[PDB]
């Protein structure tokens, strides 16, 4: 037929269409809903940078005073993705808002499809032409962090890391292949010079997408180092390999130069002159390898008298010297050697991040190959066989590209071991080496013959071997696509309760029009951010867990205290004010210390921070992880007697009982700010009032069609019914049920000792509080009382109501309470009763103006009897 020299493009097109179905069509209904949902968190910060860059085109900010309030943080996100989305938005006339997000959602998907090309190139320039076709197909179905970070809506720079790293290695090894065996006058032609120039541009674009992309230079230097010290071992045109590297690194340094001075110091992620020195310094190291080979060529190592081994040895001594004599700038070493800390994380606080946890390990510290299936499918094991075979073949053929690919493979495996995120780097590794595996078997099992016997050839073809070549193609491709089809059917991002709450914040908190204007200003790059930023108008901060910082800035257009850059977390052990030391504050006086230092005016708390994410906040605040279970106790159990019990230790739980897989928090938890805010609805606090709460968790919103959420008994039976139903399958109860179970445990363990109850009802997913000076209600009191209590009923915008209590002790025959709610406020969460203030046997009722709450007015209210 016509597929002659042309099937290889027929598979690439089919591979691209499979990639489109997984990346664009599968998560389509998850990205395009009630709004355009960019996935995760970081795609929302790129969206922030892009609509600012579009407004100030062609200029770009390198420091953001919005996030990390009130200090601002330097922007490490690369100019590649920022300028790509910015130009893409202008071409489609989408400069902000939902229309801009719809354009940005396709960029990660297109990068995932386009990755077929650099994977083909790298595989062809190392192995053969058939294997490059398998690798292109396999990279179209590999799941895990590669597929999820290249899906529709996940406009992050991780796909462009993988795209440009593989592009750099392919173009570099293509340049070495086009240059080897030729003299310099031939390699100096424009046709030959184009190959290392292209390789240098791909390296520059790699760094321009990721400040830590300079790591490609020591990897390429590792190619030359091992090719030199093994001159009799490996067979490589070392002189032309050195010259390709010189041109490649010089061009890359020129590409990086115009972006090199946007950080006031050396940095490995921020766009600083450190990366410029790594690229420029790599060019002179490659130029030093030029002399060592030019000296070995003439025979300089035998005239001095060291032997053929001398040339390897002088490389080793200079590898030690040329680094040792680079003490001319010790900050360079400190940042260069800093890479070894990247794959290690004894921080513990950092461990609580979902993307950083080490591969091959459970949250119990035991080896596992379970993520290898969930992230690569069969390609991992098919990839190891291709790696081991490549090592076997390298020891026989001694091809240099096969050696460099192995070095790349082993370096990416160490990074994969460190953090599970770097699976987006190892994805192209298993796809390339499984292609090497499947290509070996397809030739030895006569499938390459039967394919050409199918049209226009004659071969001795064993259908028994062909049937098995088809059967292991099954095993490599089918279970891999199964996981990719499932994982691509949903996309992450904020839920409606988070989005609705944040849009409400943007339109119902003061200065929304000033924040909107300041959101698009081209901020100057400061020399330091250790002092609070000098804002052009009176700003305020919004404190929450660091997960939601980008959502706060991009959706609410408000300045968050903490962000997904793990900035603004703070801790308690050092009294560093931040998110953790605020939400784990054990009394309101300490939380006011943290809030005042950070100029906090608003608090956003969700049910996640209340339940399953509270453990991380105690880990950050305390630093030590075993020092964090102090906030936790035992478990609930459904015993064979048909009753529900509670035990401190697992041994106290009776046999045949059914253990709700939910660790009930300790008494210390219920005294912290997160409990007082979300689980007690702000009761007991004098400087905070609830102003807005979102809808319920979806499960309980569904439950309310047949459950009376004003009936504590009906809620309790429903929560206990669900918890057992899901404990039967070893699954935790839903979040809305975890909150109800948390409230039930407080009433059965720590309530009777105090007298302040909590309604067993559920509540809204996201809750917003405003920081208040507070109306000071002070007055005289009778002769023999030591305590004064305040009572008021609050009703939220979801028609849910709760009690606000506060108790103070009498001193000098006088009480003083500070009240955060008012009775003429504009907020959708209002009190429906006056304040009932009790002083022993004397009761009085008071209503408070909003002006007295804002300005902290003192009100005299005596509760005294003669007696």
């Amino acid at each position: 037929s016509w597929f002659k020299k042309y099937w290889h493009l027929s598979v690439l097109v089919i591979a691209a269409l499979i990639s489109v179905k997984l990346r664009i069509l599968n998560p389509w209904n998850s990205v395009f809903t009630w709004t355009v949902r960019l996935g995760g968190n970081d795609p929302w910060y790129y969206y922030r940078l892009i609509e600012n860059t579009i407004h100030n085109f062609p200029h770009r900010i390198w420091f953001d005073p919005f996030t990390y309030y009130p200090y601002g943080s330097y922007t490490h996100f690369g100019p590649f993705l920022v300028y790509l989305g910015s130009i893409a938005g202008i071409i489609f006339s989408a400069t902000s808002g939902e229309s801009l997000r719809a354009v940005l959602a396709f960029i990660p998907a297109i990068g995932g499809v386009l990755a077929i090309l650099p994977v083909y190139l790298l595989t062809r320039e190392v192995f053969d032409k058939r294997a490059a076709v398998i690798a292109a197909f396999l990279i179209a179905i590999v799941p895990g962090q590669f597929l999820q970070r290249s899906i529709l809506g996940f406009n992050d720079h991780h796909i462009w890391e993988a795209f440009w790293q593989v592009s750099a290695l392919g173009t570099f090894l293509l340049a070495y292949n086009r240059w080897k065996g030729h003299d310099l006058s031939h390699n100096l032609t424009a046709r030959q010079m184009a190959y290392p120039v292209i390789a240098g541009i791909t390296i520059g674009l790699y760094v321009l997408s990721w400040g830590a992309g300079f790591i490609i230079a020591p990897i390429i230097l590792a190619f030359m180092f091992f090719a030199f010290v093994l001159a009799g071992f490996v067979n490589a045109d070392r002189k032309n390999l050195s010259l390709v590297a010189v041109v490649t690194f010089a061009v890359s340094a020129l590409i990086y130069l115009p972006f090199a001075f946007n950080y006031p110091g050396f940095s490995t992620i921020f766009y600083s002159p450190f990366q410029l020195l790594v690229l420029l310094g790599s060019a002179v190291i490659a130029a030093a390898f030029y002399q060592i080979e030019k000296w070995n060529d003439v025979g300089f190592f035998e005239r001095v008298g060291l032997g053929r081994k001398g040339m390897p040895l002088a490389v080793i001594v200079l590898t030690a010297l040329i680094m040792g004599l680079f003490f001319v700038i010790s900050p360079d070493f400190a940042r260069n050697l800093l890479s070894v800390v990247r794959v290690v994380q004894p921080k513990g606080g950092a461990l609580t991040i979902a993307e950083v946890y080490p591969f091959f390990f459970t949250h119990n510290g035991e080896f596992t190959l379970t993520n290898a299936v969930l992230h690569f499918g069969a390609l991992f094991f098919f990839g190891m066989a291709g790696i081991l075979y490549s090592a076997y073949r390298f020891l026989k053929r001694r091809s240099f590209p096969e050696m460099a690919l192995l070095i790349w493979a082993i370096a990416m495996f160490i990074a994969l071991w460190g953090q599970n995120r770097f699976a987006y780097y190892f994805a192209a590794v298993s796809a390339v080496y499984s292609a090497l595996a499947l290509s070996v078997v397809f030739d030895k099992l006569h499938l390459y013959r039967a394919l050409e016997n199918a049209i226009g050839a004659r071969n001795k073809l064993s259908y028994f071997r062909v049937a098995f070549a088809l059967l292991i193609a099954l095993a490599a491709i089918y279970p891999t696509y199964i996981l990719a089809d499932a994982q691509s059917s949903y996309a992450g991002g904020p839920n409606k309760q988070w989005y609705d709450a944040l849009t409400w914040m943007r339109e119902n908190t003061p200065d929304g029009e000033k924040y909107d204007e300041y959101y698009l200003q081209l901020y100057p790059t400061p020399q330091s951010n250790k002092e609070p930023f000098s804002y052009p108008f009176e700003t305020y901060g919004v404190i929450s867990w660091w997960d939601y910082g980008h959502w706060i800035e991009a959706v609410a257009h408000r300045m968050p205290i903490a962000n997904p850059f793990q900035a603004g977390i703070g801790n308690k052990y050092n009294n560093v004010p931040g998110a953790s030391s605020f939400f784990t504050a054990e009394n309101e006086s300490y939380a006011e210390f943290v809030a005042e230092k950070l100029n906090v005016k608003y608090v956003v708390s969700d049910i996640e921070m209340e339940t399953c994410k509270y453990y991380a906040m105690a880990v950050w605040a305390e630093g030590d992880l075993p020092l964090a279970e102090k906030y936790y106790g035992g478990y609930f159990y459904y015993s064979p007697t048909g009753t529900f019990g509670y035990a401190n230790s697992q041994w106290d739980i009776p046999l045949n009982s059914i253990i709700i897989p939910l660790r009930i928090p300790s008494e210390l938890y219920y005294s912290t700010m997160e409990a007082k805010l979300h689980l007690f609805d702000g009761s007991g606090l004098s400087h905070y009032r609830m102003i807005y709460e979102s809808d319920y968790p979806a499960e309980w919103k569904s439950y309310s069609s047949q459950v009376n959420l004003n009936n504590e008994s009906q809620v309790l039976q429903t929560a206990l019914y669900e918890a057992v139903m899901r404990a039967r399958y070893g699954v935790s109860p839903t979040m809305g049920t975890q909150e109800v179970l948390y409230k039930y445990a407080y009433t059965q363990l720590y309530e009777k000792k105090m007298g302040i109850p909590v309604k067993i009802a559920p509540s809204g997913y996201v809750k917003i509080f405003e920081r208040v000076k507070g109306a000071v209600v002070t007055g005289k009191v009778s002769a023999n009382v030591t305590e004064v209590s305040v009572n008021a009923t609050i009703k939220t915008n979801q028609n849910r109501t709760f009690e606000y209590w506060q108790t103070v002790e009498v001193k000098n025959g006088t009480y003083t309470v500070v009240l955060p709610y008012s009775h003429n406020s504009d907020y959708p969460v209002k009190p429906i009763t006056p304040y009932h203030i009790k002083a022993g046997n004397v009761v009085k009722e008071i209503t408070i103006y909003e002006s007295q709450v804002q300005n902290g007015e003192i009100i005299q209210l005596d509760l005294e009897l003669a007696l």
């Binding site: 996935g39 995760g40 968190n41 970081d42 962090q145 999820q148 970070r149 609580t352 991040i353 979902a354 993307e355 946890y357 949250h363 599970n420 995120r421 994982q487 949903y490 992450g492 867990w545 660091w546 997960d547 997904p564 996640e608 339940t611 399953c612 994410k613 453990y615 991380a616 979040m735």
Partner: peptide, 9 residues
């Protein structure tokens, strides 16, 4: 889906 967020929820 593990991304730049707190885990186990």
């Amino acid at each position: 889906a593990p991304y730049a967020v707190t885990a186990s929820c």
